[PDB]
Structure 1
Amino acid sequence: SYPTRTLANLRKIGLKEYFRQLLYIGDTKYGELVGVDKFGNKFYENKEELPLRTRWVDYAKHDYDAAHIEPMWHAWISYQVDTPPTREPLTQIERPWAPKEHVPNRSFTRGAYKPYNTTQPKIQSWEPKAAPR
């Protein structure tokens, strides 16, 4: 940041937010809200910003992780689409089999994925039947 920008952004957002942003982003950013994840994450845009900085996320959780971003918004934050998931029709195809809840990266927890064989064994042994003598 530079003095003209930082004071201009500080004037807009207020001192309390300025110190919150110095705690997570470490920057002083101002922009307009574009939408909210199913996880509470907040997304802003400002085309009057340096390249690749015009879109950013305010992470909902304190222990913020990049894998907390919902799939459609993961494309918007990545400049892979320009239309935000608010205005994007593919977020309207009803899929009853889709995760209703937020399914993040589960590693380092007890919810970590455990792999397994999905197939039965290939050879079946005889169950012995000792006929009476």
Structure 2
Amino acid sequence: MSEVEPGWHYWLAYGTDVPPNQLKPEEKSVRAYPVKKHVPNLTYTDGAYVPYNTARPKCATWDPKVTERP
């Protein structure tokens, strides 16, 4: 089911009478970034999404530095 493109996915659910290919331009989505091919849900495959922490550790250790006795 996830292969269904999100624009049409709302039409197949009887939530709209206007198919996504019949939208008037005043209503469409205009993006500044490329819209590549649709990608389904990727479970059970190596392309599965992996969560990770986007924040650096809150403590920064000290860089070893030595100056000799004067």
TM-score by length of 2: 0.78
Q: Which structure carries more helix by proportion? A: 1
Distance (Å, rounded) in 2 between the aligned partners of 1:73 and 1:82:
11
How far off its partner does 1:98 sit? 4.4
5+ residue gaps, structure 2: none
How far off its partner does 1:131 sit? 2.3
Give the alignment's Cα RMSD to 1 decimal: 1.7
Distance (Å, rounded) in 1 between the aligned partners of 2:53 and 2:37:
27
| Residue in structure 2 matched with residue 70 of structure 1 by the alignment | 5
* Greater RCO structure (CA 8 Å; 6+ sep): 2
How far off its partner does 1:94 sit? 3.3
Runs of 4+ that moved beyond 2 A: 130-133
Is 2:30 aligned against 1:94?
yes
Letter in 2 for 1:69: V
5+ residue gaps, structure 1: 1-65
| Residue in structure 1 matched with residue 39 of structure 2 by the alignment | 103
Give the paired residue count.
Answer: 67
Letter in 2 for 1:109: T
TM-score by length of 1: 0.45
Question: Percent identical across equivalent pairs?
Answer: 43
Is 2:19 aligned against 1:84?
yes
How far off its partner does 1:128 sit? 1.6
Distance (Å, rounded) in 1 between the aligned partners of 2:47 and 2:35:
15
